[PDB]
Design a protein around this ligand. Structure first.
Ligand SMILES: [Mg+2]
Ligand SMILES: [Mg+2]
Ligand SMILES: [Mg+2]
Ligand SMILES: [Mg+2]
Ligand SMILES: [Mg+2]
Ligand SMILES: [Mg+2]
Ligand SMILES: [Mg+2]
Ligand SMILES: [Mg+2]
Ligand SMILES: [Mg+2]
Ligand SMILES: [Mg+2]
Ligand SMILES: [Mg+2]
Ligand SMILES: [Mg+2]
Ligand SMILES: [Mg+2]
Ligand SMILES: [Mg+2]
Ligand SMILES: [Mg+2]
Ligand SMILES: [Mg+2]
Ligand SMILES: [Mg+2]
Ligand SMILES: [Mg+2]
Ligand SMILES: [Mg+2]
Ligand SMILES: [Mg+2]
Ligand SMILES: [Mg+2]
Ligand SMILES: [Mg+2]
Ligand SMILES: [Mg+2]
Ligand SMILES: [Mg+2]
Ligand SMILES: [Mg+2]
Ligand SMILES: [Mg+2]
Ligand SMILES: [Mg+2]
Lengths: 52, 185, 148, 52, 58
RNA sequence: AAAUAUGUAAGAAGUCCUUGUUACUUAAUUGAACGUGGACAUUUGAAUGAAGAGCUUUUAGUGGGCCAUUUUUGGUAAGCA
RNA sequence: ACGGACCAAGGAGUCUAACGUCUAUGCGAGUGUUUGGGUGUAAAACCCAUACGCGUAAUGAAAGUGAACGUAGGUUGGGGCCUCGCAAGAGGUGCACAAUCGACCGAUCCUGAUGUCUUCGGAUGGAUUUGAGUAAGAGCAUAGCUGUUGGGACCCGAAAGA
RNA sequence: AUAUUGGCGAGAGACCGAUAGCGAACAAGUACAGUGAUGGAAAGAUGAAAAGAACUUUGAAAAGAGAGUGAAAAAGUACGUGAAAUUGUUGAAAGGGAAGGGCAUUUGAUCAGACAUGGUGUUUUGUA
């Protein structure tokens, strides 16, 4: 039973509707795995450099 | 001076505080290091060490292996402890209604256990159930079945899988392997 | 990465880990596979017995397509039935409804009898089957239909 | 739909949300579960007295 | 240029540095090398007694 | 025919008792080997010390040596070999 | 014995293809999206089908053959668990692992059943022989140190050859 | 559908930053060497703006001393910042065929902190 999530309006006041957690927020949080994945994926947008 | 009998400042050589930085795993180590300190049950000390082991030292344990252990006399209702991962086995067709505790359950293995009426349990839930390992059973996967162990200790008259990239005819099946060509091994 | 390399730890030490006497020359023993029947004989025989010489018969223009013959053991061959119908067929173990398993479609050429299939009669089609493999199949009440 | 849950598919072929290796992240609460308290032995004083 | 031919200096030091280990004898030593006529009998004798114990303890 | 060096042993994987196996062996329930079951426990089999014991993988450097007492070879001898 | 009159700046184990051991991670009898396609805030990120690569079967030069007699065996030693006992201890179960004897598959040498296009088929049962095998799978991918090879290959160095 | 260190036109980089990066960020394939084929550099930065020092004085002159511009001439066309080797002046110290160094101390020079604390308390002012 995901507890609830309050929904806000563009005017800043909470609306009547409330939604459950999408059950992905309960996934394990692994700082180590994210750190390794981030290190590799951040290298994907790179341009080659070389001396003549 | 001191006529030293043995090497000084020598490490114990046994891994403690496993070098993996899995924060959840460290919590499990944090839990059991408290148990083994203040429970005096030999089960806790065994499990604590088993958490430190490396990947090769934590071979997968098949569900078929679980079935064999439960078939032992007077072990049907015991709780199975697997410090590692549990892999599904399609070679088996009957599974009992046991409960098992393991670090990881593969999707196939977890489905098989649940479909058999049992439940998959994490190590912490075991601790609250059996703080001193009441009625438990620890299983270990095979270590020598690794491919790398085949080449270990290669030498004359040993037959220990010489390291090779490509296998087949004319790849190390000549002089030195048969008496028609020089000698045999 | 470089910053973890022992080279960074070898800065300031004159030999860079290569020692004083032996040093690190260009190619002290030779290049590549030199010395198999020579100064490197000891390693080659101890660790690679059977390297030198020819043993078999030559095959000209070998096409690795005639020899395509994947093997299947009897502990498998129930995975080839989808999980949805696997429970149905196992409990409804009877003839005149035996599931048809086309091992060729799965991409297997020969059936090998590793052992211990259940007592459910099944119909499996394969290009080849070993003796004991089929004896286990029809002992359960099944039969094999040879296909090509 | 994007990540799935215990009741819906994940919309990515053969994907399932990862599972936790530990039921909860609060070890102190478990240690105070009292199933363990009964099993546990009495404690010292956290600072061994300097003897001799 | 002449050079030292052979010597045994420092050898005992080297051997005793890791110690001279006993061969670590085992129970049930290997039957490799004993007379084969005894083996072919010994195989059937152990087969026979295995059946006898299995039936008696059954 | 020494001295110094050197192999082996000082138990539980032991001792004793009874009978099961075998195509081996015997003139033969005769033997052999492996066993079933039964009995003998810390003075369990000399001294001392054990700092933990056992085991695996991988790899660096090294592969020019020299000196001293004692034994000793060539040489007259050598800071000689 | 060699180099060093002095000072500033530059200056020497890197990168790659293929790999070995070990470690971490993900998945797990499977594993690998990024050849390519769709999509995009556009060399990023996200999604995707078929094959293919390695693994799940090995052994023979090859034709070929192909892994359960049995609780997937017996025996010995085993952490741990269970029972009794205050404990000491006694008994049971004993994964991984270690030793040993067996069992199954392939090769070699034998034995040669039922039969027959009468020369084909090889049943059955053995053998101080042999395999980089089976015996309720562990592998695939990524990354990291170290080590190897081919590369200018730690940096500078020929007399020569075309 | 494929190739393209050339040519033309564009967009970018966990690239280099004037001993680097093309040999060439500059009148660089230039100056220069060789009969010749060929070989081949060094060299970027005042200041916002020259406002680049009118004028006086000493000197033959270059320049110096003043004056002045400038936020700054400790930015003056030898010009941003201006290190080291090496040198001059000033100041201190020691020195009988080296100097330099290690331990401890004398002597000289030079240098930081601790010295309100809370508090008895109002012998008190700006009365708290
Ligand atoms: Mg000391
Ligand atoms: Mg050193
Ligand atoms: Mg080194
Ligand atoms: Mg050197
Ligand atoms: Mg060397
Ligand atoms: Mg030598
Ligand atoms: Mg000689
Ligand atoms: Mg003796
Ligand atoms: Mg070496
Ligand atoms: Mg060496
Ligand atoms: Mg040398
Ligand atoms: Mg000289
Ligand atoms: Mg020299
Ligand atoms: Mg000189
Ligand atoms: Mg420098
Ligand atoms: Mg695949
Ligand atoms: Mg495909
Ligand atoms: Mg391949
Ligand atoms: Mg066995
Ligand atoms: Mg390399
Ligand atoms: Mg050269
Ligand atoms: Mg001239
Ligand atoms: Mg200034
Ligand atoms: Mg300036
Ligand atoms: Mg300046
Ligand atoms: Mg200076
Ligand atoms: Mg003088």
């Amino acid at each position: 039973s995901r507890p609830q999530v309050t929904v806000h309006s563009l005017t800043g006041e909470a609306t009547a509707n409330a939604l459950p957690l999408p059950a992905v927020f309960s996934a394990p949080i692994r700082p180590d795995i994210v750190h390794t994945v981030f290190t590799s994926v951040n290298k994907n947008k790179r341009q080659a450099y070389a001396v003549s | 001076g001191i006529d030293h009998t043995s090497k000084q400042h020598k490490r114990s050589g046994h891994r403690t505080a496993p070098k993996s930085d899995n924060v959840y795993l460290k919590l499990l180590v944090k839990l059991y290091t408290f148990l083994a300190r203040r429970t005096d049950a030999p089960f806790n000390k065994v499990v604590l060490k088993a958490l430190f082991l490396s990947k090769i030292n934590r071979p997968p344990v098949s569900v078929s292996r679980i079935a064999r252990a439960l078939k032992q006399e007077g072990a049907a209702n015991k709780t199975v402890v697997v410090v590692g991962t549990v892999t599904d086995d399609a070679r088996i067709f009957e599974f009992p209604k046991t409960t098992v505790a393991a670090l990881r359950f593969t999707a196939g293995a977890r489905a098989k256990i649940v479909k058999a009426g049992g439940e998959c349990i994490t190590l912490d839930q075991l601790a609250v159930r059996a703080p001193k390992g009441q009625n438990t059973l620890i299983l270990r996967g095979p270590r020598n079945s690794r491919e790398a162990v085949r080449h270990f200790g290669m030498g004359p008259h040993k037959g220990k899988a010489p390291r090779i990239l490509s296998t087949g005819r004319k790849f190390e099946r000549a002089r030195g392997r048969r008496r028609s060509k020089g000698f045999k091994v | 990465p470089s910053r973890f390399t022992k080279t960074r730890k070898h800065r300031g030490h004159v030999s860079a880990g290569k020692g004083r006497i032996g040093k690190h020359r260009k190619h002290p023993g030779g290049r590549g596979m030199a010395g198999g029947q020579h100064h490197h004989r000891i390693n080659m025989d101890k660790y690679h017995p059977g390297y030198f010489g020819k043993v078999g018969m030559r095959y000209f223009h070998k096409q690795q397509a005639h020899f395509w013959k994947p093997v299947l053991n009897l502990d498998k061959l129930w995975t080839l039935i989808p999980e949805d119908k696997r429970d149905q067929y196992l409990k409804s173990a009877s003839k005149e409804t035996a599931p048809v398993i086309d091992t060729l479609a799965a991409g297997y050429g020969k059936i090998l009898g590793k052992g211990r299939i259940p007592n459910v009669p099944v119909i499996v089609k394969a290009r080849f089957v070993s003796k004991l493999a089929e004896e286990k199949i029809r002992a359960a009440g099944g039969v094999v239909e040879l296909i090509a | 739909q994007v990540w799935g849950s215990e009741t819906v598919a994940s919309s990515k072929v053969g994907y399932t949300l990862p599972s936790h290796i530990i039921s909860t992240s609060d070890v102190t609460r478990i240690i105070n579960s009292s199933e363990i308290q009964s099993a546990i032995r009495p404690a010292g004083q956290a600072t061994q007295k300097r003897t001799h | 240029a002449k050079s030292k031919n052979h010597t045994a200096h420092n050898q005992t030091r080297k051997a005793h540095r890791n110690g001279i280990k006993k061969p670590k004898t085992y129970k049930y030593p290997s039957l490799k090398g004993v007379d084969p006529k005894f083996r072919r009998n010994h195989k059937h004798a152990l087969h026979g007694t295995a059946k006898a114990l299995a039936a008696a303890k059954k």
